[PDB]
Structure formats: structure tokens, C-alpha cells
Amino acid sequence: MFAQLVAQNVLLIDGPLSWYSDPGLAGVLSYKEDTKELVVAKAGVYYVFFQLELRRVVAGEGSGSVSLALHLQPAAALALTVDLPPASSEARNSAFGFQGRLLHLSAGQRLGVHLHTEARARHAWQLTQGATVLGLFRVT
Amino acid sequence: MFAQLVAQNVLLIDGPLSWYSDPGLAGVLSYKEDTKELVVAKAGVYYVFFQLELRRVVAGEGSGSVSLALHLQPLRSAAGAAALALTVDLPPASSEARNSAFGFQGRLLHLSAGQRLGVHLHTEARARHAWQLTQGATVLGLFRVT
């Protein structure tokens, strides 16, 4: 039992991320599109991980931080905070974060990922389309 | 068989971390508190990971780096390089004030039946008192792949 989802969001708007099943895992734990949650099918201990890449689109603009937070819809299970460096001669135009940890997920536990931006000139940084991944796999 | 432990340590003091089993994993490879060691129950190939999170507790101060090192004990020959090592840089308190730091690192380890595992904190920092390990954020996890 495993799953890997890719966020559909590009723009740094605070709120719940909308996912799509990783297309790379074609040959094969449901995702409910309306409520924007991944529902855990069978109960167990899962190694749950998520990552995000950011990119500067507006040259010479934007600084601040971006936060990812896994929440158990039925205090955060997982939490990332990527720093968006300010613009300088140092062309530091992308940013990346990764965190994984063993989570005890109950049978039918809903999962939502939330984007939180505390940034000046937010529009200048965006999520590199296809790099915001949430994945998990069981160990029981 | 898996394991996930959280360090009790808050202060940035060079020496071994003192662990507790993740309260999150209430429904269930022990921790020897007299020597601060996780003892591996069964022999296998494990995907072992650890992460560290720091918090600026005194505004303005804190420049340096904080390192984590997973050693297998007693030390088995080689050049005594750690099995796992994280080094987290402490941002300086400047214009773009960043009041936290994170690090994650994981890899496959071959652990023998009964292997003792010690985690060590080292600080190569100035004003170490102005940063602390965030409560329940310094985690050591592992699960068997075999």
C-alpha cells in the first residue's frame, strides 16, 4: 500500500493544495477532489514524506517564506518551511524543501496539505509545477 | 519492525541526545537511558533517517552551525565516521529575520542484532544560548527494508 500525489498549484496563494496522482506511477488510498483530501484506506504506520520546489519568476523581486503543512482532517503531522532568499547579484532563483517521518494513520483518516506564504512580492516566487509531491507507503 | 524517537533536548549543548518514543506512535527496539542509546532488536537493512529543527529563542543573537551524528556503538574500526550526519546552519539575525532552521537526512544502514545507536549533538556556534532544538522536532526514525 502506497501513493504519490503531485500538487496542481503554481501560484503562492495561502490555502489547501489540490493534488493529482503522480503520472509516473501509471502501472498500479483514494484522493477526494471536492474536499481536497487523500483518504487512508487501511490503518497502519506509514512513512509519509513531502517536498516542494520554488522558483523566482519576477527577476529582482520577492523574499519571505513558504510553509507546507499536512493536517489530519478527522498542530501538524508534517511541516516544512522553505526560505525564499531576497534578490541580489547572487542569482539564488530556486528553493527546495523536504521532510519525511513515520506517521500512525487510522483507517479512513483524511489528509490535507496547506500552503502558507508569509512573503513580500509573493507573485515573484511560484511552485515549480511538478515538484510539489506528497508520498507515503506502509510498513505494517 | 519500525521505530521513531523524539529528543528531549532543547539546549544547544555538545553531547549525546536523550530520546523518548514518539507519543504519536502510541499503538505498537528499545532505548537504554543509562547510556542514551537506541538498541536495534533484529538484524536487517534499515532505512534510517533523522531531522533537526532550530528556533531562535533570543532575538538578534545566533551565528553558527549545529551538527547531528549517528554513531554505532561500540565504535567498529574504519575512521569512525558517523553512520548519519546532519549539519544545520543558523541564519544571522539580520533584515530578513529567519527565526528557524531545519535539516533532514536519511539512508540505508546495515544494523546487526543488538546494535547500540548513539546520537550526538555538536555546536560550532556563537551565542548558542539564543537558539534551541524545537520541542518534538528532533526525530530519529527507522524501518526494516528486509
Add this chain to the structure above:
Amino acid sequence: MFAQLVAQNVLLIDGPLSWYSDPGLAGVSLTGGLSYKEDTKELVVAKAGVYYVFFQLELRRVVAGEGSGSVSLALHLQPLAAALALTVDLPPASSEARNSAFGFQGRLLHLSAGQRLGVHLHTEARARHAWQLTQGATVLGLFRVT
């Protein structure tokens, strides 16, 4: 069914990384039919399936006061693109001396029988020789999930 290589490369050159099996995984002989070819600097997948693939990077500033730029790692699967990508900042040299950089990435990959996993190192830097891969710290790992 698992594998873990440690890169030989120290000097930052653009090109495919050269690997050696993790010594601290010697005890486990039949890891799986996941053999490494030295001619092509690639690892060949034996049995198809969904694998948790991960890689690590660790750079150090060897020439004090020099070097700035970025360093990428790209896992290419052949035949079919860049399955995993890490891009690490080599901070400019300053008084508030940040002199080390880490990279970690891992994701579930669908690998096929006989597929070849290769890692490419690309460098975009000023005073490129001032930064260097820490020997024993660049790693590629695998393990079947299915």
C-alpha cells in the same frame, strides 16, 4: 531488493558521477540483482516495481573566501527524463561564513526490469574549485515497495 551507492567524485566537474557500493552494506551480499556497470556510470534495475529512490549531496568550501553559485544533481532513467533533481546553493564567501551545503531528495519511482539509473552533476559557479563534494557524503539509494 535494495541498493545504495557512494560517489567517488570529489572535484566539481560537469558530467556523470562515478559510484561504488556502500561499504557499510558489505555484510548483505544478494541485495537484489541490482548490479552496477562501471563502463556506463549506471546502476541497472533487476526486478521491476515501485521503489523509494533517494539521493544526497554535501559540499564544502575548500578555498576560503572564494566560490559562489549552484550545483545540480539529476537522476536519469534510461530508457525513458530527470527523475530526481537537487539544486544546491554554494553561498558567496562572507564574514557570516556559511561554508557547507546539503541536498536531500527522495520519491517513489516506477522502475522497469533492466532500466539504467544514472546521476549527472552540473555546476554553474564562479571560482568552482573553491567548492567540492565531501567524500562519502554523495549517496544514491533504492528499495522496492511492491
